[PDB]
Symmetry: C2
Subunit: 260 residues, 2 copies
């Protein structure tokens, strides 16, 4: 279905009943990425999987891609679904959205699973890489994606890197102007920075990082886990940016651990 937030349609799917779990997909992808999580958790929970604005089946306006605005889209979805508080599972930019949600709407948070995310991402990337995105968008993005999956994943599951390279090459799913607008926003995916405000996040937080993730380094997740009070970090062996796809069942067990 769709919710409307200030004229922008956000697509979402909702299955099952119980304690709500909200899945927030990584940048340039969509809700489909949660295929192996969505339905097993729909057996025990109220699963809500969202397409961010500018992604997949949601509207893709020319501008308005701050993490705060994304968070407001999420709140719109929760409002239409009459949800008070929810479990938030965020991947990359989804983690950003979840954290921002903890900042602006702590009253709607049960807890967080942050998968492969960080803050002040833009300044942490090599300076040349931005120029690479200005010079050759698709090429630079591909190069970045070769560091998003583990070697073991490249061996046994090449379809992951395939589908992820496909995600940003399909204008129907992820048009170029959304990338440009998000990069241009002073609080977009690259510029969003809450290093000083992390310690205000008090909700139960499980930060999960892949050992071989070069898109989001172990240090980047560590910055998150170390400054959020009572946060736990799990550095996952033989995994890159997409734990939910690289080793789906194990991610499912880890998320199953967040219950009490």
């Amino acid at each position: 279905p769709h919710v409307e937030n200030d004229g922008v349609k956000i697509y979402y799917d909702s299955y099952g009943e119980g304690v709500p779990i909200v899945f927030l997909h990584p940048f340039s992808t969509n809700g489909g990425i949660w295929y192996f999580q969505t339905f097993p958790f729909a057996q025990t929970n109220h699963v809500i999987v969202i397409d961010h604005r500018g992604h997949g089946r949601s509207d893709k306006p020319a501008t308005g891609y701050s993490i705060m605005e994304h968070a407001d889209d999420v709140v719109a979805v929760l409002d239409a679904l009459k949800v008070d508080r929810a479990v938030f599972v965020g991947n990359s930019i989804g983690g950003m959205i979840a954290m921002q949600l903890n900042l602006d709407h702590p009253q709607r948070v049960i807890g967080n699973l942050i998968l492969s995310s960080g803050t002040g991402l833009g300044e942490g990337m090599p300076p040349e890489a931005g120029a690479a995105f200005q010079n050759d968008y698709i090429g630079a993005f591909g190069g970045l994606l070769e560091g998003a999956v583990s070697a073991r994943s490249k061996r046994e599951r090449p379809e992951i890197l395939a589908v992820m390279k496909a995600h940003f090459s399909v204008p129907s799913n992820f048009p170029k102007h959304v990338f440009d607008a998000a990069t241009a926003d002073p609080n977009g995916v690259f510029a969003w920075n809450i290093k000083d405000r992390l310690s205000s996040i008090q909700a139960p937080t499980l930060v999960v990082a892949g050992e071989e993730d070069l898109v989001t380094t172990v240090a980047n997740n560590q910055l998150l886990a170390d400054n959020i009070p009572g946060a736990e970090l799990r550095v996952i062996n033989d995994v890159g940016h997409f734990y939910q796809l690289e080793r789906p069942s194990e991610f499912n067990e880890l998320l199953r651990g967040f219950v009490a």
Copy 2:
């Protein structure tokens, strides 16, 4: 998006430009299952992925679920999208739908990839099984799905059997009344039989079967391949019912190289 057909809303997703390829998911699942195919093929083709009636995000009436009405839903989607002709990729019941569409609308078919399907399936089921599905629906369905996955896939990718067992256990995705209505239909999943008319299908057709598939045997697919004029049979090692999930990249390579 979605189209109305017989007052029943059929959900579909649409990506890309070019030669139309229509993905039809197996029984009790939904379009999400095509995640690793949908977007790589959206780079080169016009991908159209459909949620069957009684499944996923589409409407789920009490009746009725003959293969013909399913097919008609597909042509409804094609009509709304102004698509004249398309390549059809159907799995299990999706293959049935595709074949029925070949029977009723041959001018709408470029070619077919029929994956793990059959006809007159209900005749091949053990005499006891029928009662088993209403006495113990969950258990019998699960037992059915344990023969739909290869040993290697159950070993290295348990998330597949997990998500498939999840599909029919979540009423929001697949309610039992759809199963029962489909079973009760004289032209439903089990009763649909076109052995007589297989020789009428003239489109380029690739029938693909998993060697360890037990819900549709190698024999089941082989009958189709042997009676459809010019049809190909490809038997895949260490794959059961879900080649597009068990070895997604390999399935991809097979599909890009298929004539259509």
